[PDB]
Amino acid sequence: DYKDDDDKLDRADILYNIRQTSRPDVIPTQRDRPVAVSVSLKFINILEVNEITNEVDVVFWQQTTWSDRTLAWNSSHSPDQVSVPISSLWVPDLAAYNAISKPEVLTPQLARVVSDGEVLYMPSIRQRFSCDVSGVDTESGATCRIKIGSWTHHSREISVDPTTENSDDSEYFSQYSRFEILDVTQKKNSVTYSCCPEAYEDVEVSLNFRKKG
Amino acid sequence: DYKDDDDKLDRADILYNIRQTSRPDVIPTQRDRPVAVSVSLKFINILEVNEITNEVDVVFWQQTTWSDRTLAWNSSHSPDQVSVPISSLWVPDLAAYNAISKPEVLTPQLARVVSDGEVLYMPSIRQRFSCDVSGVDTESGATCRIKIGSWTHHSREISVDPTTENSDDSEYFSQYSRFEILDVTQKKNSVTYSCCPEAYEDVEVSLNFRKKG
Amino acid sequence: DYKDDDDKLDRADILYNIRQTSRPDVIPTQRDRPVAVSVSLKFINILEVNEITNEVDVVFWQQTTWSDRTLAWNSSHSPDQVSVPISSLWVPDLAAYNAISKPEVLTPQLARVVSDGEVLYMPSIRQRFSCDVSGVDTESGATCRIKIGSWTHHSREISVDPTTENSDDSEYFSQYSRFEILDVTQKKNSVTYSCCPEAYEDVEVSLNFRKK
Amino acid sequence: DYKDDDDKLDRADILYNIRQTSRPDVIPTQRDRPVAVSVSLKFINILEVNEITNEVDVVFWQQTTWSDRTLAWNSSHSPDQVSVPISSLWVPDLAAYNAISKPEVLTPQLARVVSDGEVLYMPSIRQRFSCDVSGVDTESGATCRIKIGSWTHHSREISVDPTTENSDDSEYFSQYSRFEILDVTQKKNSVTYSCCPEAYEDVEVSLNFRKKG
Amino acid sequence: DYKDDDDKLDRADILYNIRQTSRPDVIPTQRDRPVAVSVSLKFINILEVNEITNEVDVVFWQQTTWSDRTLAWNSSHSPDQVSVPISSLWVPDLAAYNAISKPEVLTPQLARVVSDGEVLYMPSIRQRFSCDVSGVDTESGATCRIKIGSWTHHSREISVDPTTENSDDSEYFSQYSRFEILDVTQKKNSVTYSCCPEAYEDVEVSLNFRKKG
Numbered sequence A, B, D, E: 001d002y003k004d005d006d007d008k009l010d011r012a013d014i015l016y017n018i019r020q021t022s023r024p025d026v027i028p029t030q031r032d033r034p035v036a037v038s039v040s041l042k043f044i045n046i047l048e049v050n051e052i053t054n055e056v057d058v059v060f061w062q063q064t065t066w067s068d069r070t071l072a073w074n075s076s077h078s079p080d081q082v083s084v085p086i087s088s089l090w091v092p093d094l095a096a097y098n099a100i101s102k103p104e105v106l107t108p109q110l111a112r113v114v115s116d117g118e119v120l121y122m123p124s125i126r127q128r129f130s131c132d133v134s135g136v137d138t139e140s141g142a143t144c145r146i147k148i149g150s151w152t153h154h155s156r157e158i159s160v161d162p163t164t165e166n167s168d169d170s171e172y173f174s175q176y177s178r179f180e181i182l183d184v185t186q187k188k189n190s191v192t193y194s195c196c197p198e199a200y201e202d203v204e205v206s207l208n209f210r211k212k213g
Numbered sequence C: 001d002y003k004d005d006d007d008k009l010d011r012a013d014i015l016y017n018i019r020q021t022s023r024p025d026v027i028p029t030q031r032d033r034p035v036a037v038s039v040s041l042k043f044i045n046i047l048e049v050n051e052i053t054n055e056v057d058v059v060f061w062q063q064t065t066w067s068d069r070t071l072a073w074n075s076s077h078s079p080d081q082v083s084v085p086i087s088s089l090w091v092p093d094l095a096a097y098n099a100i101s102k103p104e105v106l107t108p109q110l111a112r113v114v115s116d117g118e119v120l121y122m123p124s125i126r127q128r129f130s131c132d133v134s135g136v137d138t139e140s141g142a143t144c145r146i147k148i149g150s151w152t153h154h155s156r157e158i159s160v161d162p163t164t165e166n167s168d169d170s171e172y173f174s175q176y177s178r179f180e181i182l183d184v185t186q187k188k189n190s191v192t193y194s195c196c197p198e199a200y201e202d203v204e205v206s207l208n209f210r211k212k
């Protein structure tokens, strides 16, 4: 009930309920099924690209959501949603497999827990990757391939599900960038290695971009 | 009253009361209305500026207020205000939407709590932004916009409001800066996304400045 | 039982068990024998190189395993493995003896504990080293040696066992790098000092690489 | 009693007593008057100077004292002083008002507590400032001024006093700097703002220096 | 004895005894005499040398030992040594008096505690220094002096004593550095200031090095 959203004690009790139920270190696997983690990046900017090193700086909003039904409550007469520090929640152990720098999180480390058990988490992140930035000054542009998946959970435990959607890019990418976006695709992928046969699901995010002009 | 300001025991007890009552993770919505958060940036210095890449590096005192009547106390014969570590208080989850570096806090992380429940928090912050830097070498100057709002609380839950609409920050801006501030305007602004319909309020700050001839 | 892998309560119970049993600060020596730690670096990228100062800046996945049998459980009808924050576990105090920068860990700091007591830990690390960069612009390439071993545990306490394989890390190394890996090999070595006769085992990693 | 300094049990007991009595978050006012804080900067090095940007990068020892006579003990047969982590103590919430970078503390964060309740704190700090570097390469030199005061406590609560008005920091400043110090002067003022009537005290440090030749 | 070194229960009990007994914030003075701290820097690399600014950036292993007999135990049929997190131990508050950057620790922060109560601690540290760099390009090389001592403990509480006085660090220094070490000498030194009477002991490390030709 949105009318009850600003009931302070209601919010405090939901938070208390969330923290009691939450097992921040245990994957929330409903029904003997992998946790489905939906992710999609919204690029905000492309910063220091170096063609002498093949490195780029990106800023993106990591739209991330999953379900934990044990967190659900009755919101007939209480807030529909509250904000919760992620230290009180299980959060998927996502990583950019091919990153070359730490994720620099630029935003308050809070998620939204919806009364149905849905969790929404969208950090703004600056991070460096190794990219093919050779044709960045040409009309065909450059490509970054960013791969994001669970660092330690294989596909029986965590499933990673991407959403490619370029229509709303305009709402996100800075208009003052040295660069423009030709194309973003975010595709579901599976990773295996010679040593280790189990499949790890990831989103492969392809950023095709070039200098304006 | 200010005759009792330096009563050590009083301050200690006020701090104790604040801590017992304070819920650092719950928005202090009094009645059933959004928390009104007032924000005003006083710019202190423009350190670096890149016209080619449209980035700025600035220092600013972020004057921040809101009130939590539950923290209030009768101060006829006690301190009117004390200093409180913000780890003991709720603070709004503000983020600069077009920031490209972590805000670097340069000051003790303390807030002032007033006996009427008003909270004042003014961190000195250094941070980088993507904004319009063109015109910096002209008489008219560049106009750089900085949008700041709550990261996770929509307008039903938090309202952001600019304190001052203008100023030049002459009481604040360094006289030794290679730049000079022409004007600073602060404006209420609203943001929505086509994925997510609820409105998030923000203050949009416009910094009109230029290089010294 | 992999069919039980997703039994949430099972997982939570395993984790609680692991935490009750685990001594994060004590080496898990079994049968009064040294802890065998297998290490394996998989290079992700080589970022910058200075032939004048003999420095390299690299990113690598450090494949690390060891056993702690006291953590073992019967998985007849429960998960085969769980993820565990390494703050809850003993991890070997490994260091690169020729690092000239701090190990910048890029990944979530978790290990896998397997029901037989096996622990797998694989941080992605960016770090700078001092090593031989001569020949980086020749077709033989440079050969940069990186030495990693325990910082405080001598060889009767921790033994380091380099493993397979011999490869150019093709499944791992970025194709977008300005460098190519010719070869990566690993070798067991030992270190002693005239102040300190006890032997410290290390893996010696030889990175043979050149500029494109 | 200096004969008793190395009595371990005594030291431990003193530290226990200090921690039991200490209120790290409460200003140690005595007799309902402002905490008197003595501050003095001993400059060690001037690293980088930029006359275009008016920035300096310096290293100094911040000599800092104040009294909390509640920490005092009878040292007739016990150590005169002990070292205490400052997290176990109240420390003034000092900040450089014209700092453009975080204070980098280079030394163990320890204070000395004296049996008479005197507290001595001296971090080595490297920090960048916005100040006057006009004339760095003249024989008269540049006079860079730094203001340091409490961030959240007005003059009725904390008073900040320079210690020795003038020296040339002979026993401190690196003989290997490419700059030389002509004079350092430290004087009281106060700062007020039209928004905020109450007065904040600070020490204003004037650093007169030039490049050697 | 070493045949019991891998007795896990024993190690655990030793670590438990050490933690029960240890006072990490109190100097381990025995016999009411100053704590004897032995220090020697083994240099690993000389990364950067600046002759215009007289700065030096090095990596060294700070070999450090002292004794706390209260930690001792009977090792007839138990381990002779264990590794201990330095957070559980008292460590001397050492600082480089001419450091201009924070000591960056590159190694696990663990010490060895021997059953006779000796403590060994050897962090690899990367740090920057202001020191005399003139002559680095000559045959005689540069002699860069580094002074390390307790930050808050004077001569009656802590005595710093150089271990080896002369070495070329040939077992430690990288063969791959562009510099080479002619000699490393370490001398006991003492330091006082006009403001403050009592003496502070330190080790003067003279690093005589030059560019390879």
Ligand SMILES: Nc1nc(-c2ccc(O)cc2)cc(N(Cc2ccccn2)Cc2ccccn2)n1
Pocket: A038, A063, A064, A065, A110, A111, A112, A120, A121, A122, A123, B150, B151, B152, B191, B193, B195, B196, B200
């Ligand atoms: N553009 C946008 N996208 C999402 C989102 C999130 C998850 C997802 O799977 C898909 C979309 C959420 C979202 N907001 C809410 C929210 C929730 C949590 C953290 C942060 N924010 C609103 C919002 C407005 C303004 C600034 C930041 N967030 N805004």
Ligand SMILES: Nc1nc(-c2ccc(O)cc2)cc(N(Cc2ccccn2)Cc2ccccn2)n1
Pocket: B038, B063, B064, B065, B110, B111, B112, B120, B121, B122, B123, B163, D150, D151, D152, D191, D193, D195, D196, D200
């Ligand atoms: N110029 C100025 N503005 C404010 C202020 C704060 C919040 C707000 O909404 C509007 C104005 C407070 C303020 N001071 C007090 C205070 C209080 C809290 C934290 C920090 N400081 C005085 C002050 C002087 C000098 C250095 C820092 N603070 N000074």
Ligand SMILES: Nc1nc(-c2ccc(O)cc2)cc(N(Cc2ccccn2)Cc2ccccn2)n1
Pocket: A097, A150, A151, A152, A191, A193, A195, A196, A200, C038, C040, C063, C064, C065, C110, C111, C112, C120, C121, C122, C123
């Ligand atoms: N290539 C690879 N190697 C290993 C590995 C680990 C230890 C060892 O001794 C040898 C090899 C494990 C491993 N994964 C599992 C795991 C486990 C623990 C932490 C992290 N990851 C799968 C995996 C795929 C992709 C991204 C991260 N992990 N992948």
Ligand SMILES: Nc1nc(-c2ccc(O)cc2)cc(N(Cc2ccccn2)Cc2ccccn2)n1
Pocket: D038, D063, D064, D065, D110, D111, D112, D120, D121, D122, D123, E150, E151, E152, E191, E193, E195, E196, E200
């Ligand atoms: N030159 C100097 N000045 C002071 C000092 C401090 C406060 C003050 O108001 C005036 C002078 C203290 C002091 N030492 C003692 C002390 C005490 C506490 C922390 C740190 N140090 C001795 C000392 C020697 C050498 C390296 C560091 N300290 N040395």
Ligand SMILES: Nc1nc(-c2ccc(O)cc2)cc(N(Cc2ccccn2)Cc2ccccn2)n1
Pocket: C150, C151, C152, C191, C193, C195, C196, C200, E038, E063, E064, E065, E110, E111, E112, E120, E121, E122, E123
């Ligand atoms: N060369 C060397 N010197 C020392 C040492 C230590 C203290 C001292 O006063 C003098 C010398 C100890 C030492 N090791 C053991 C130890 C113990 C503790 C921490 C770290 N290391 C062996 C060792 C081998 C290899 C890599 C690191 N340590 N190695």
Ligand SMILES: *[C@@H]1O[C@H](CO)[C@@H](O)[C@H](O)[C@H]1NC(C)=O
Pocket: A074, A076, A077
């Ligand atoms: C809780 O939800 C149930 C399910 O619709 C409903 O029957 C009940 O009235 C709700 N509780 C209230 C409104 O207090």
Ligand SMILES: *[C@@H]1O[C@H](CO)[C@@H](O)[C@H](O)[C@H]1NC(C)=O
Pocket: B074, B075, B076, B077
């Ligand atoms: C509290 O109530 C009023 C102030 O609103 C005042 O008249 C009264 O004396 C106060 N009592 C106290 C401070 O104990």
Ligand SMILES: *[C@@H]1O[C@H](CO)[C@@H](O)[C@H](O)[C@H]1NC(C)=O
Pocket: C074, C075, C076, C077
């Ligand atoms: C555990 O393992 C034993 C054999 O080691 C097996 O017989 C028993 O059924 C198992 N118990 C469980 C899974 O509870």
Ligand SMILES: *[C@@H]1O[C@H](CO)[C@@H](O)[C@H](O)[C@H]1NC(C)=O
Pocket: D074, D075, D076, D077
């Ligand atoms: C402190 O103790 C000594 C003896 O223990 C005594 O002589 C002295 O008077 C005491 N001082 C006070 C203030 O009690």
Ligand SMILES: *[C@@H]1O[C@H](CO)[C@@H](O)[C@H](O)[C@H]1NC(C)=O
Pocket: E074, E075, E076, E077
């Ligand atoms: C204690 O030490 C003595 C001699 O050092 C030895 O005989 C005895 O066995 C030891 N007792 C233990 C380790 O319990």
